[PDB]
Protein backbone atom coordinates (compact mmCIF):
# COMPACT_ATOMS: atom_id res chain seq x y z
CA UNK A 1 0.00 0.00 0.00
CA UNK A 2 1.01 3.69 0.49
CA UNK A 3 1.40 6.27 -2.29
CA UNK A 4 3.99 4.59 -4.54
CA UNK A 5 3.61 7.46 -7.06
CA UNK A 6 6.60 9.51 -5.84
CA UNK A 7 7.54 10.51 -9.43
CA UNK A 8 6.35 13.37 -11.64
CA UNK A 9 3.26 12.81 -13.81
CA UNK A 10 3.95 16.02 -15.74
CA UNK A 11 7.16 15.80 -17.81
CA UNK A 12 8.76 17.56 -20.79
CA UNK A 13 8.14 16.07 -24.24
CA UNK A 14 10.83 16.18 -26.99
CA UNK A 15 9.26 19.38 -28.43
CA UNK A 16 9.52 21.07 -25.00
CA UNK A 17 5.80 21.07 -24.18
CA UNK A 18 4.52 20.16 -20.71
CA UNK A 19 1.64 17.91 -21.82
CA UNK A 20 -0.49 17.92 -18.67
CA UNK A 21 -0.37 21.73 -18.37
CA UNK A 22 -1.44 22.11 -22.02
CA UNK A 23 -4.26 19.61 -21.46
CA UNK A 24 -5.28 21.46 -18.28
CA UNK A 25 -5.53 24.67 -20.34
CA UNK A 26 -7.72 22.76 -22.82
CA UNK A 27 -10.07 21.92 -19.91
CA UNK A 28 -10.18 25.65 -19.06
CA UNK A 29 -11.11 26.45 -22.69
CA UNK A 30 -14.14 24.13 -22.40
CA UNK A 31 -15.19 25.89 -19.17
CA UNK A 32 -17.88 28.58 -18.92
CA UNK A 33 -16.83 32.19 -19.58
CA UNK A 34 -15.79 34.46 -16.72
CA UNK A 35 -14.31 37.97 -16.82
CA UNK A 36 -12.85 40.84 -14.78
CA UNK A 37 -12.70 44.62 -15.34
CA UNK A 38 -10.66 47.16 -13.35
CA UNK A 39 -12.11 50.66 -12.79
CA UNK A 40 -10.50 53.71 -11.14
CA UNK A 41 -12.47 53.28 -7.89
CA UNK A 42 -13.11 49.51 -7.99
CA UNK A 43 -12.99 46.10 -9.71
CA UNK A 44 -15.76 43.85 -11.06
CA UNK A 45 -15.63 40.07 -11.59
CA UNK A 46 -18.47 38.18 -13.28
CA UNK A 47 -19.51 34.81 -14.70
CA UNK A 48 -22.50 32.78 -15.95
CA UNK A 49 -24.17 30.33 -13.54
CA UNK A 50 -24.49 27.23 -15.76
CA UNK A 51 -27.20 25.19 -14.02
CA UNK A 52 -26.80 21.39 -14.21
CA UNK A 53 -30.55 20.84 -13.74
CA UNK A 54 -33.56 23.14 -13.22
CA UNK A 55 -34.28 21.15 -10.03
CA UNK A 56 -30.83 22.23 -8.76
CA UNK A 57 -30.66 25.35 -6.58
CA UNK A 58 -27.92 27.44 -8.22
CA UNK A 59 -27.74 29.77 -5.18
CA UNK A 60 -26.12 26.92 -3.20
CA UNK A 61 -23.31 26.74 -5.80
CA UNK A 62 -21.12 29.86 -5.58
CA UNK A 63 -18.68 30.47 -8.46
CA UNK A 64 -17.56 33.84 -7.04
CA UNK A 65 -15.90 33.44 -3.63
CA UNK A 66 -14.61 35.77 -0.90
CA UNK A 67 -10.97 34.99 0.01
CA UNK A 68 -10.36 37.97 2.31
CA UNK A 69 -12.61 40.96 3.15
CA UNK A 70 -10.86 42.89 0.32
CA UNK A 71 -10.16 40.02 -2.15
CA UNK A 72 -12.52 37.91 -4.30
CA UNK A 73 -12.06 35.11 -6.84
CA UNK A 74 -13.83 33.64 -9.88
CA UNK A 75 -12.78 30.85 -12.30
CA UNK A 76 -13.20 28.97 -15.56
CA UNK A 77 -12.69 25.19 -15.86
CA UNK A 78 -13.28 22.39 -13.35
CA UNK A 79 -15.49 23.43 -10.41
CA UNK A 80 -14.30 20.86 -7.83
CA UNK A 81 -10.65 21.88 -8.41
CA UNK A 82 -11.65 25.52 -7.87
CA UNK A 83 -13.55 24.73 -4.65
CA UNK A 84 -10.54 23.10 -2.94
CA UNK A 85 -8.26 25.92 -4.19
CA UNK A 86 -10.55 28.46 -2.48
CA UNK A 87 -10.31 26.44 0.76
CA UNK A 88 -6.49 26.35 0.55
CA UNK A 89 -6.31 30.02 -0.51
CA UNK A 90 -8.42 31.18 2.45
CA UNK A 91 -6.25 29.17 4.86
CA UNK A 92 -2.88 30.32 3.46
CA UNK A 93 -3.96 33.97 3.81
CA UNK A 94 -4.14 33.27 7.56
CA UNK A 95 -1.27 30.82 8.20
CA UNK A 96 1.42 32.48 6.06
CA UNK A 97 0.32 36.12 6.60
CA UNK A 98 -2.44 37.18 9.04
CA UNK A 99 -1.13 35.05 11.93
CA UNK A 100 2.29 36.71 11.39
CA UNK A 101 1.50 40.37 10.54
CA UNK A 102 -1.96 40.82 12.14
CA UNK A 103 -3.44 42.05 8.84
CA UNK A 104 -4.67 40.57 5.54
CA UNK A 105 -2.22 40.03 2.66
CA UNK A 106 -2.08 42.39 -0.32
CA UNK A 107 -3.66 41.01 -3.51
CA UNK A 108 -0.37 40.29 -5.32
CA UNK A 109 1.03 38.17 -2.45
CA UNK A 110 -2.11 36.08 -1.90
CA UNK A 111 -2.14 35.51 -5.68
CA UNK A 112 1.54 34.51 -5.37
CA UNK A 113 0.66 31.88 -2.71
CA UNK A 114 -2.16 30.38 -4.82
CA UNK A 115 0.20 30.31 -7.81
CA UNK A 116 2.76 28.38 -5.72
CA UNK A 117 0.14 25.75 -4.81
CA UNK A 118 -0.77 25.33 -8.49
CA UNK A 119 2.90 25.13 -9.55
CA UNK A 120 3.55 22.30 -7.06
CA UNK A 121 0.73 20.23 -8.62
CA UNK A 122 2.76 20.56 -11.84
CA UNK A 123 6.01 19.10 -10.38
CA UNK A 124 5.29 17.05 -7.21
CA UNK A 125 4.92 13.27 -7.21
CA UNK A 126 1.71 11.46 -8.13
CA UNK A 127 -0.53 14.45 -8.93
CA UNK A 128 -2.05 16.11 -12.00
CA UNK A 129 -2.18 19.91 -12.44
CA UNK A 130 -5.27 21.88 -11.42
CA UNK A 131 -7.74 22.18 -14.32
CA UNK A 132 -8.66 25.84 -13.71
CA UNK A 133 -7.73 29.42 -14.51
CA UNK A 134 -8.49 31.93 -11.74
CA UNK A 135 -9.32 35.63 -11.87
CA UNK A 136 -8.57 37.31 -8.53
CA UNK A 137 -9.71 40.88 -7.86
CA UNK A 138 -8.71 42.81 -4.74
CA UNK A 139 -7.68 45.99 -2.90
CA UNK A 140 -4.96 46.91 -0.40
CA UNK A 141 -3.77 50.21 1.09
CA UNK A 142 -0.40 50.57 -0.69
CA UNK A 143 -1.24 49.05 -4.13
CA UNK A 144 -4.86 50.18 -4.56
CA UNK A 145 -7.14 48.08 -6.77
CA UNK A 146 -5.76 45.18 -8.83
CA UNK A 147 -6.85 42.24 -11.02
CA UNK A 148 -4.83 39.04 -11.61
CA UNK A 149 -5.15 35.90 -13.75
CA UNK A 150 -3.66 32.59 -12.51
CA UNK A 151 -3.15 29.68 -14.96
CA UNK A 152 -2.66 25.88 -14.39
CA UNK A 153 1.12 26.30 -14.82
CA UNK A 154 1.21 28.63 -11.79
CA UNK A 155 1.90 31.72 -13.91
CA UNK A 156 0.05 34.93 -13.04
CA UNK A 157 -0.39 38.24 -14.88
CA UNK A 158 -1.92 41.59 -13.84
CA UNK A 159 -4.75 42.87 -16.08
CA UNK A 160 -6.68 46.09 -16.69
CA UNK A 161 -9.46 43.84 -17.98
CA UNK A 162 -9.70 40.28 -19.33
CA UNK A 163 -11.81 37.16 -19.89
CA UNK A 164 -11.18 33.40 -19.64
CA UNK A 165 -12.99 30.24 -20.79
CA UNK A 166 -15.49 29.42 -23.55
CA UNK A 167 -15.78 32.72 -25.48
CA UNK A 168 -12.71 34.50 -24.12
CA UNK A 169 -11.30 35.43 -27.55
CA UNK A 170 -14.39 37.45 -28.55
CA UNK A 171 -14.89 38.81 -25.01
CA UNK A 172 -11.31 40.15 -24.82
CA UNK A 173 -11.79 41.97 -28.15
CA UNK A 174 -15.05 43.49 -26.85
CA UNK A 175 -13.27 44.73 -23.69
CA UNK A 176 -10.44 46.35 -25.71
CA UNK A 177 -12.92 48.62 -27.55
CA UNK A 178 -14.70 49.71 -24.34
CA UNK A 179 -11.92 49.99 -21.72
CA UNK A 180 -10.31 53.34 -20.87
CA UNK A 181 -8.27 54.51 -17.84
CA UNK A 182 -11.08 56.85 -16.65
CA UNK A 183 -13.81 54.21 -16.12
CA UNK A 184 -15.85 54.61 -12.93
CA UNK A 185 -17.03 51.45 -11.12
CA UNK A 186 -20.63 51.72 -12.38
CA UNK A 187 -19.36 52.06 -15.96
CA UNK A 188 -17.27 48.88 -15.50
CA UNK A 189 -20.29 46.93 -14.19
CA UNK A 190 -22.26 48.08 -17.25
CA UNK A 191 -19.52 46.89 -19.63
CA UNK A 192 -19.22 43.58 -17.72
CA UNK A 193 -22.93 42.85 -18.26
CA UNK A 194 -22.68 43.78 -21.96
CA UNK A 195 -19.63 41.55 -22.51
CA UNK A 196 -21.24 38.59 -20.73
CA UNK A 197 -24.49 38.70 -22.77
CA UNK A 198 -22.48 37.82 -25.91
CA UNK A 199 -21.27 34.50 -24.43
CA UNK A 200 -24.52 33.59 -22.61
CA UNK A 201 -27.12 31.77 -24.73
CA UNK A 202 -30.20 31.02 -22.61
CA UNK A 203 -31.72 33.15 -19.84
CA UNK A 204 -29.87 36.37 -18.95
CA UNK A 205 -30.97 37.66 -15.53
CA UNK A 206 -29.85 38.03 -11.88
CA UNK A 207 -30.49 34.32 -11.18
CA UNK A 208 -28.31 33.03 -14.06
CA UNK A 209 -25.53 35.63 -13.61
CA UNK A 210 -23.09 35.85 -10.70
CA UNK A 211 -21.31 39.17 -10.14
CA UNK A 212 -19.23 40.70 -7.32
CA UNK A 213 -17.29 43.94 -6.83
CA UNK A 214 -14.23 45.20 -4.99
CA UNK A 215 -15.07 48.84 -4.15
CA UNK A 216 -15.74 51.12 -1.17
CA UNK A 217 -15.68 49.84 2.41
CA UNK A 218 -19.07 48.55 3.65
CA UNK A 219 -19.52 49.43 7.37
CA UNK A 220 -23.03 47.90 7.30
CA UNK A 221 -21.51 44.48 6.39
CA UNK A 222 -18.89 44.54 9.19
CA UNK A 223 -21.20 43.15 11.91
CA UNK A 224 -20.00 45.43 14.72
CA UNK A 225 -19.19 49.04 15.68
CA UNK A 226 -16.73 50.77 18.04
CA UNK A 227 -13.34 50.43 16.33
CA UNK A 228 -12.75 53.46 14.01
CA UNK A 229 -9.91 51.83 12.02
CA UNK A 230 -12.08 48.80 11.13
CA UNK A 231 -14.42 50.09 8.39
CA UNK A 232 -15.74 46.90 6.70
CA UNK A 233 -15.17 44.62 3.69
CA UNK A 234 -14.54 46.06 0.21
CA UNK A 235 -15.72 42.76 -1.32
CA UNK A 236 -19.46 42.67 -2.02
CA UNK A 237 -21.56 40.14 -3.93
CA UNK A 238 -24.33 41.84 -5.94
CA UNK A 239 -27.81 40.46 -5.24
CA UNK A 240 -30.12 38.96 -7.88
CA UNK A 241 -32.31 42.08 -7.57
CA UNK A 242 -29.36 44.50 -7.92
CA UNK A 243 -28.36 42.86 -11.23
CA UNK A 244 -31.88 43.11 -12.72
CA UNK A 245 -32.05 46.84 -11.89
CA UNK A 246 -29.00 47.42 -14.11
CA UNK A 247 -30.33 45.14 -16.89
CA UNK A 248 -33.23 47.56 -17.58
CA UNK A 249 -30.94 50.53 -18.31
CA UNK A 250 -28.76 48.29 -20.51
Amino acid sequence: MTDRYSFSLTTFSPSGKLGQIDYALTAVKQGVTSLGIKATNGVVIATEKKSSSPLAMSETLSKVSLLTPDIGAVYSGMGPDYRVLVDKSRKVAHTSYKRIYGEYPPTKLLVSEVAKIMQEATQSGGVRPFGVSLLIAGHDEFNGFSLYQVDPSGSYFPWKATAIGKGSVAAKTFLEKRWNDELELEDAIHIALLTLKESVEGEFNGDTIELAIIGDENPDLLGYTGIPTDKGPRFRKLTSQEINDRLEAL
Binding site: S8, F12, L18, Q119, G154, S155, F157, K160
Partner: protein, 244 residues
Protein backbone atom coordinates in the same frame (compact mmCIF):
# COMPACT_ATOMS: atom_id res chain seq x y z
CA UNK B 1 2.11 -1.42 -9.53
CA UNK B 2 2.95 2.20 -10.34
CA UNK B 3 6.13 1.31 -12.32
CA UNK B 4 3.91 1.29 -15.44
CA UNK B 5 3.40 5.08 -15.37
CA UNK B 6 6.94 6.19 -14.42
CA UNK B 7 8.59 8.38 -17.08
CA UNK B 8 12.03 7.95 -15.43
CA UNK B 9 12.99 11.64 -15.48
CA UNK B 10 16.57 11.12 -14.23
CA UNK B 11 18.11 8.66 -16.73
CA UNK B 12 20.69 8.77 -19.52
CA UNK B 13 20.06 8.30 -23.23
CA UNK B 14 22.24 5.76 -25.08
CA UNK B 15 24.31 8.78 -26.23
CA UNK B 16 24.89 9.92 -22.62
CA UNK B 17 22.46 12.86 -22.53
CA UNK B 18 19.74 13.62 -19.98
CA UNK B 19 16.41 13.50 -21.87
CA UNK B 20 14.49 15.81 -19.54
CA UNK B 21 17.25 18.43 -19.36
CA UNK B 22 17.48 18.54 -23.18
CA UNK B 23 13.70 18.89 -23.50
CA UNK B 24 13.63 21.62 -20.83
CA UNK B 25 16.23 23.57 -22.84
CA UNK B 26 14.00 23.16 -25.91
CA UNK B 27 11.16 24.72 -23.87
CA UNK B 28 13.37 27.64 -22.80
CA UNK B 29 14.33 28.39 -26.43
CA UNK B 30 10.73 29.56 -27.05
CA UNK B 31 10.73 31.96 -24.07
CA UNK B 32 11.28 35.71 -24.45
CA UNK B 33 14.92 36.67 -24.96
CA UNK B 34 16.90 38.07 -22.03
CA UNK B 35 20.30 39.77 -22.34
CA UNK B 36 23.00 40.59 -19.80
CA UNK B 37 25.96 42.87 -20.55
CA UNK B 38 28.77 43.59 -18.07
CA UNK B 39 30.57 46.95 -18.33
CA UNK B 40 33.53 48.28 -16.31
CA UNK B 41 31.29 50.65 -14.28
CA UNK B 42 28.09 48.54 -14.11
CA UNK B 43 25.84 45.80 -15.52
CA UNK B 44 22.80 45.97 -17.82
CA UNK B 45 19.86 43.54 -17.77
CA UNK B 46 17.39 43.65 -20.66
CA UNK B 47 14.52 41.27 -21.40
CA UNK B 48 11.63 40.95 -23.86
CA UNK B 49 8.14 40.22 -22.48
CA UNK B 50 6.24 37.35 -24.12
CA UNK B 51 3.67 38.57 -26.71
CA UNK B 52 1.82 41.29 -24.77
CA UNK B 53 -1.88 42.22 -24.80
CA UNK B 54 -2.94 45.90 -24.78
CA UNK B 55 -5.09 45.37 -21.63
CA UNK B 56 -2.13 44.02 -19.60
CA UNK B 57 -1.19 46.19 -16.60
CA UNK B 58 2.40 47.09 -17.47
CA UNK B 59 3.62 49.18 -14.49
CA UNK B 60 2.61 46.83 -11.62
CA UNK B 61 4.00 43.81 -13.53
CA UNK B 62 7.03 41.56 -13.02
CA UNK B 63 7.80 38.64 -15.37
CA UNK B 64 11.49 38.71 -16.36
CA UNK B 65 13.55 40.74 -13.85
CA UNK B 66 13.65 39.86 -10.13
CA UNK B 67 15.60 41.20 -7.15
CA UNK B 68 17.44 38.60 -5.01
CA UNK B 69 19.05 41.09 -2.63
CA UNK B 70 20.29 44.71 -2.80
CA UNK B 71 23.43 43.67 -4.74
CA UNK B 72 22.15 40.79 -6.94
CA UNK B 73 19.36 40.46 -9.54
CA UNK B 74 18.28 37.83 -12.08
CA UNK B 75 16.77 37.75 -15.57
CA UNK B 76 14.44 34.79 -16.22
CA UNK B 77 13.82 32.66 -19.31
CA UNK B 78 11.34 29.75 -19.06
CA UNK B 79 8.39 28.91 -16.80
CA UNK B 80 7.79 31.90 -14.50
CA UNK B 81 6.18 29.75 -11.79
CA UNK B 82 9.26 27.48 -11.68
CA UNK B 83 11.51 30.54 -11.48
CA UNK B 84 9.66 32.01 -8.47
CA UNK B 85 10.17 28.77 -6.50
CA UNK B 86 13.92 29.07 -7.11
CA UNK B 87 13.98 32.86 -6.56
CA UNK B 88 12.45 32.51 -3.06
CA UNK B 89 14.99 29.80 -2.22
CA UNK B 90 17.81 32.07 -3.45
CA UNK B 91 16.44 35.01 -1.42
CA UNK B 92 16.40 32.86 1.74
CA UNK B 93 19.91 31.51 1.06
CA UNK B 94 21.27 35.08 0.82
CA UNK B 95 19.72 35.95 4.19
CA UNK B 96 21.10 32.76 5.80
CA UNK B 97 24.60 33.79 4.72
CA UNK B 98 24.13 37.37 5.99
CA UNK B 99 22.81 36.04 9.32
CA UNK B 100 25.75 33.63 9.69
CA UNK B 101 28.70 35.83 8.64
CA UNK B 102 27.33 39.41 8.92
CA UNK B 103 28.43 39.98 5.31
CA UNK B 104 26.46 40.08 2.05
CA UNK B 105 26.73 36.81 0.11
CA UNK B 106 29.35 36.61 -2.68
CA UNK B 107 27.63 36.27 -6.07
CA UNK B 108 29.21 32.94 -7.10
CA UNK B 109 28.28 31.25 -3.81
CA UNK B 110 24.60 32.11 -4.33
CA UNK B 111 24.78 30.99 -7.99
CA UNK B 112 26.47 27.67 -7.09
CA UNK B 113 23.84 26.74 -4.48
CA UNK B 114 20.93 27.53 -6.80
CA UNK B 115 22.66 25.54 -9.55
CA UNK B 116 23.23 22.64 -7.11
CA UNK B 117 19.48 22.50 -6.42
CA UNK B 118 18.80 22.21 -10.16
CA UNK B 119 21.45 19.46 -10.43
CA UNK B 120 19.69 17.40 -7.74
CA UNK B 121 16.46 17.24 -9.75
CA UNK B 122 18.43 15.62 -12.62
CA UNK B 123 20.14 12.89 -10.54
CA UNK B 124 17.57 11.78 -7.93
CA UNK B 125 13.94 12.05 -6.79
CA UNK B 126 12.19 11.06 -10.03
CA UNK B 127 10.76 14.57 -10.53
CA UNK B 128 10.86 16.78 -13.63
CA UNK B 129 13.62 19.43 -13.71
CA UNK B 130 12.94 23.17 -13.41
CA UNK B 131 12.30 24.61 -16.89
CA UNK B 132 14.27 27.79 -16.19
CA UNK B 133 17.48 29.52 -17.26
CA UNK B 134 18.79 32.46 -15.20
CA UNK B 135 21.07 35.37 -15.99
CA UNK B 136 22.60 36.49 -12.67
CA UNK B 137 23.77 40.12 -12.43
CA UNK B 138 25.50 41.21 -9.22
CA UNK B 139 28.34 42.89 -7.33
CA UNK B 140 30.60 41.96 -4.41
CA UNK B 141 33.91 43.32 -3.09
CA UNK B 142 35.96 40.30 -4.29
CA UNK B 143 35.31 40.15 -8.05
CA UNK B 144 33.25 43.34 -8.51
CA UNK B 145 30.70 43.18 -11.33
CA UNK B 146 29.77 39.64 -12.42
CA UNK B 147 27.44 37.98 -14.92
CA UNK B 148 26.49 34.30 -14.66
CA UNK B 149 24.02 31.93 -16.30
CA UNK B 150 22.52 28.66 -15.08
CA UNK B 151 20.25 26.18 -16.90
CA UNK B 152 18.10 23.10 -16.00
CA UNK B 153 21.19 20.81 -15.91
CA UNK B 154 22.54 22.82 -12.95
CA UNK B 155 25.60 23.90 -14.92
CA UNK B 156 26.71 27.53 -14.57
CA UNK B 157 29.27 29.76 -16.33
CA UNK B 158 30.54 33.36 -16.14
CA UNK B 159 30.20 35.91 -18.95
CA UNK B 160 31.08 39.41 -20.18
CA UNK B 161 27.90 39.43 -22.26
CA UNK B 162 25.28 36.69 -22.68
CA UNK B 163 21.73 35.93 -23.85
CA UNK B 164 19.17 33.29 -22.85
CA UNK B 165 15.79 32.22 -24.24
CA UNK B 166 14.83 32.71 -27.88
CA UNK B 167 17.28 33.50 -30.71
CA UNK B 168 20.41 33.17 -28.54
CA UNK B 169 22.47 32.07 -31.56
CA UNK B 170 21.72 35.28 -33.47
CA UNK B 171 21.89 37.41 -30.30
CA UNK B 172 25.29 36.03 -29.24
CA UNK B 173 26.80 36.69 -32.69
CA UNK B 174 25.65 40.34 -32.51
CA UNK B 175 26.99 40.79 -28.96
CA UNK B 176 30.29 39.13 -29.93
CA UNK B 177 30.56 41.63 -32.80
CA UNK B 178 30.07 44.98 -31.00
CA UNK B 179 31.26 44.24 -27.43
CA UNK B 180 34.64 45.50 -26.17
CA UNK B 181 36.25 45.43 -22.70
CA UNK B 182 36.60 49.18 -21.95
CA UNK B 183 32.83 49.64 -22.54
CA UNK B 184 30.72 51.88 -20.27
CA UNK B 185 27.20 51.28 -18.88
CA UNK B 186 25.46 53.77 -21.20
CA UNK B 187 27.09 52.07 -24.20
CA UNK B 188 26.02 48.64 -22.89
CA UNK B 189 22.43 49.91 -22.50
CA UNK B 190 22.49 50.81 -26.21
CA UNK B 191 24.01 47.45 -27.26
CA UNK B 192 21.41 45.48 -25.28
CA UNK B 193 18.46 47.33 -26.83
CA UNK B 194 19.97 47.21 -30.34
CA UNK B 195 20.46 43.42 -30.08
CA UNK B 196 16.90 42.73 -28.91
CA UNK B 197 15.55 45.02 -31.66
CA UNK B 198 17.26 42.92 -34.36
CA UNK B 199 16.58 39.45 -32.87
CA UNK B 200 12.95 40.09 -31.83
CA UNK B 201 10.14 38.04 -33.42
CA UNK B 202 7.86 41.11 -33.11
CA UNK B 203 7.32 43.80 -35.76
CA UNK B 204 8.89 46.63 -33.72
CA UNK B 205 10.38 46.92 -30.23
CA UNK B 206 8.28 49.15 -27.92
CA UNK B 207 8.38 50.18 -24.24
CA UNK B 208 5.41 47.99 -23.22
CA UNK B 209 7.13 44.75 -24.33
CA UNK B 210 10.37 45.30 -22.36
CA UNK B 211 11.79 45.02 -18.87
CA UNK B 212 15.06 46.79 -18.09
CA UNK B 213 17.50 47.12 -15.19
CA UNK B 214 20.97 48.43 -14.32
CA UNK B 215 23.39 47.71 -11.47
CA UNK B 216 25.77 50.67 -11.17
CA UNK B 217 28.17 52.14 -8.63
CA UNK B 218 26.40 55.35 -9.71
CA UNK B 219 25.14 56.00 -6.20
CA UNK B 220 27.17 58.35 -3.95
CA UNK B 221 30.69 56.99 -3.23
CA UNK B 222 31.71 53.31 -3.15
CA UNK B 223 28.23 51.73 -2.97
CA UNK B 224 25.97 49.89 -5.42
CA UNK B 225 22.45 50.82 -6.57
CA UNK B 226 19.83 48.63 -8.30
CA UNK B 227 17.56 50.42 -10.77
CA UNK B 228 14.54 48.47 -12.05
CA UNK B 229 13.30 50.74 -14.87
CA UNK B 230 9.75 52.12 -14.82
CA UNK B 231 7.61 52.07 -18.03
CA UNK B 232 8.16 55.79 -18.74
CA UNK B 233 11.92 55.38 -18.17
CA UNK B 234 12.07 52.57 -20.75
CA UNK B 235 10.07 54.80 -23.14
CA UNK B 236 12.67 57.57 -22.67
CA UNK B 237 15.76 55.33 -23.03
CA UNK B 238 14.22 53.85 -26.22
CA UNK B 239 13.85 57.37 -27.69
CA UNK B 240 17.30 58.46 -26.46
CA UNK B 241 18.98 55.71 -28.54
CA UNK B 242 16.68 56.35 -31.53
CA UNK B 243 14.88 52.99 -31.78
CA UNK B 244 11.47 54.74 -31.63
Amino acid sequence: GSRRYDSRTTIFSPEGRLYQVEYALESISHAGTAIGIMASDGIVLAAERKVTSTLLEQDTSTEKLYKLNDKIAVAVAGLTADAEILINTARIHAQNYLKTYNEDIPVEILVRRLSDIKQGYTQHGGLRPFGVSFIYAGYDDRYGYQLYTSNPSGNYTGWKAISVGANTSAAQTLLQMDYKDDMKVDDAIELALKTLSKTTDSSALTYDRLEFATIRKGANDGEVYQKIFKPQEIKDILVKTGIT
